[PDB]
Design a protein around this ligand. Sequence first.
Ligand code: TTP
Ligand code: TTP
Ligand code: TTP
Ligand code: GDP
Ligand code: DAT
Ligand code: MG
Ligand code: MG
Ligand code: MG
Lengths: 736, 109, 35
Amino acid sequence: MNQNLLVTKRDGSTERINLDKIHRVLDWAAEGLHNVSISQVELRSHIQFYDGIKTSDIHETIIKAAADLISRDAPDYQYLAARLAIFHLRKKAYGQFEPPALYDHVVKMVEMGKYDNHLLEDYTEEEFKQMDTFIDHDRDMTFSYAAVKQLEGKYLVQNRVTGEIYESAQFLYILVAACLFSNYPRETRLQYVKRFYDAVSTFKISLPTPIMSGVRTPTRQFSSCVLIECGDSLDSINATSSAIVKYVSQRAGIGINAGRIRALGSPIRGGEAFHTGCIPFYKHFQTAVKSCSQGGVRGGAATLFYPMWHLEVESLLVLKNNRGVEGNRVRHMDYGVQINKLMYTRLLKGEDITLFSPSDVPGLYDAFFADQEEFERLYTKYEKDDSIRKQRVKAVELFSLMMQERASTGRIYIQNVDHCNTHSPFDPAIAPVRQSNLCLEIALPTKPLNDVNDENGEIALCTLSAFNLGAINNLDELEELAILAVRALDALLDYQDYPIPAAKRGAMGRRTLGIGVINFAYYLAKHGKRYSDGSANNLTHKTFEAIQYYLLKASNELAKEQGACPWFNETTYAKGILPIDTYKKDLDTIANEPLHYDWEALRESIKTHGLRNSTLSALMPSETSSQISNATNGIEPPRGYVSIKASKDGILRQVVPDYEHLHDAYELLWEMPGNDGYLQLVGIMQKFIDQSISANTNYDPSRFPSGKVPMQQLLKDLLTAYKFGVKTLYYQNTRD
Amino acid sequence: TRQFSSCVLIECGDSLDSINATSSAIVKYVSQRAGIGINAGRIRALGSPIRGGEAFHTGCIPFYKHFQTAVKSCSQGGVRGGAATLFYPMWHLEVESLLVLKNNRGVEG
Amino acid sequence: LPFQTRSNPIPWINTWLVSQIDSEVDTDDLSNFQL
Ligand SMILES: Cc1cn([C@H]2C[C@H](O)[C@@H](COP(=O)(O)OP(=O)(O)OP(=O)(O)O)O2)c(=O)[nH]c1=O
Ligand SMILES: Cc1cn([C@H]2C[C@H](O)[C@@H](COP(=O)(O)OP(=O)(O)OP(=O)(O)O)O2)c(=O)[nH]c1=O
Ligand SMILES: Cc1cn([C@H]2C[C@H](O)[C@@H](COP(=O)(O)OP(=O)(O)OP(=O)(O)O)O2)c(=O)[nH]c1=O
Ligand SMILES: Nc1nc2c(ncn2[C@@H]2O[C@H](COP(=O)(O)OP(=O)(O)O)[C@@H](O)[C@H]2O)c(=O)[nH]1
Ligand SMILES: Nc1ncnc2c1ncn2[C@H]1C[C@H](O)[C@@H](COP(=O)(O)OP(=O)(O)O)O1
Ligand SMILES: [Mg+2]
Ligand SMILES: [Mg+2]
Ligand SMILES: [Mg+2]
């Protein structure tokens, strides 16, 4: 009873179902792999044949089937499912496997409005065919399945209504290099375009989501981090809201500083009105963030910052907790609590903390960041003034409330503002750091706005990239890699557009960059070190010194070529002060590694020629972008040998690099006894990092008596982090 | 503070610039004793292409939520709270989703 | 062995051929700590 069923090919035509087509495709993808099974993939597909079945639905099913077989025993399935997906994306964009010529593709795409018009203006056809020889389309065969799904889901130019994929992976790489160095002189342009292409397509340099998904398209905005400061006025709140809407719509992630907003009950216009409080304005900020960016690559996300001594701080700490009524809950934003040395001291001594509205304590807010001595003076005085509205809370209880909400939600963050200014590339008197960003790795100056186009305000932008620590074989390789990364990002600042005038002011004035690292866990495995025991302390000091040195040297040579950034005089570098000077001296008790690079020659060179960029280094989490090189994200240890990460289609299984050879060298996230080993490495990194680090703290309830995590250890770790100069604390992961 | 017109009528165009202008105008006039009428019928429907197809249009509701937080942002402590009425044509594509925006059932989204 | 070493091409065949937070703090212990 043969039915003779029909399948629908990609070109609409139909033919008899022929299983040998499926056999050949799988045999092709499994070639050279170990411990995989064509038979397993076909039977686990449970593919339901019906007459007229689309050939694309058949292929997309066997991709999911091979993807779900990625396991510890059969790790090479990460490459089987990747080759099936790369093959799928070639057909989706080209109708065949072999990609067209580089020139022919750019012509068609600019005509369709998918590429920026300038690509055809700044490059000739002779130059396009010459870059086509740089392209190695076989490098698409080095991605893992998680990497390809991020390319298909987020990075490759596509239609968010149709689902139509337009480009290949190597076209993305070569055009990101072409666009960034498009303004370089022709005598060295293609030399950089080739070098930068090879660096990113062989996973030496990691590029962020907006750069991967954006650099070649009409809409030019590629800075991941946007920092907006809000003043205590309706005009400033309106400008802040309008700036958020603009930047969520253009791939950016915001850090908002609404700590200046006066507390609930404060007089308005002398007493004509009752101040409704911060919460009704935070709700306005939330709807701005989630207003429009859910259709793009990723939704809009923001973290809002307020000082610990704010009068509403007890109402603000519980804004994410899922209980309570909607009137006092702002759940869909994250929050960072701002703390300094005086606040921690009240906790250790078991004393109280006095809460003020920033409108009733003149000069206290600005002193809270710039002048730690002036703060203790103004704070202790205002505590004794009885005409000033205040409210005392036991420091133990206030810290307990914060850490309780931090542990349950995981998204209540910490920013040590004194560390953010005593060990910063900025002079607190001229350009203090008063906030952070979405992921707590950015620390840049800001000034609030009076209008959407207020020229006197400053919105801090930061553009990112990362060094793959698993791809380098010698620390001196970072010299050439820092040159390529810094030049590409600094050229990006002049290449992109700016929707908010105040944002262009900071980006062009400071040219702040945030270059981090990925594959740090894999890097420690190769050196036979671990997080918890502290055997990586000296190695981290030697590693991140070289990272910062070659980054500064790169931006210093670039300052000779095109002049330092306009506002370089506002930096501590201009005064000849280096990070190796302002780091917290407690680090000398957990690292005895000497400095191995000529910092004094660079110090003199920076005094003379300056720096092209005000900041350079910042350790971002790289949750998404690091998956392209199948690297362990950022400085975090992997959750497992096969980690489960989220995606648009579903869960992705990601194998740690070099699993079969190094699975014993890895220290997994929950194999760590505690946080002291990790937090020390974060402190050692921060010695050289310009901005901050998205440091996590992790807790396994089963490792504690009675199965509950003690508040004592949450505080001891929070204090341990401050002792070693950790600027910020990001996620708090709690097992199960 | 001299503002004494009870009724304020704001019309919103199909752009982020207009939505931003509308929200800022709402915040100003609710803070000064006024009651707002918003016309957001021009905003394109959920699923429409953005910038040729670079983005998926999230719809009117995520923007209507933005208009609401503007109205209730600041005037509750003054003489009277802020209140607004939003207008849309019956033939709008999302009209079935807009008629139930006040009903106490369904999720917050 | 007459053939090359190989992993099992049909692994499925083996199925058939065999049968909160402790809220307590200690402030004195916290003062025993240098910031
Ligand atoms: C890309 C590539 C594919 N292949 C395999 C995988 C595919 O099964 C096949 C190429 O697919 P197609 O040329 O599309 O062949 P098909 O069997 O689907 O037949 P048709 O579309 O003409 O009806 O060859 C190689 O052997 N070498 C290669 O380099
Ligand atoms: C006018 C007004 C302000 N506010 C809040 C928003 C700001 O956080 C804060 C300051 O608003 P501003 O716009 O600074 O108000 P103002 O300059 O007219 O009055 P003041 O002398 O009090 O500064 O008050 C309201 O909540 N409702 C209102 O109606
Ligand atoms: C850019 C962008 C627009 N929108 C919505 C808001 C507006 O109702 C609508 C129009 O936005 P506009 O601000 O008009 O965007 P545009 O002029 O750049 O694009 P177009 O040519 O498509 O008009 O799109 C988003 O929801 N998210 C976004 O990221
Ligand atoms: N809008 C938005 N921005 C994000 C999100 N995650 C990260 N970012 C931005 O990207 C910066 C660094 O994040 P990172 O982990 O490196 O993400 P990636 O570079 O996109 O892989 C942060 O400072 C954010 O500003 C998100 O989910 N949404
Ligand atoms: N006649 C047929 N019957 C059943 N499946 C087929 C088939 N021809 C191809 N396939 C399967 C094998 C591949 O995994 C998947 C995609 O094949 P393709 O070469 O991209 O599409 P097509 O040959 O339709 O252009 O479809
Ligand atoms: Mg075919
Ligand atoms: Mg005022
Ligand atoms: Mg428009």
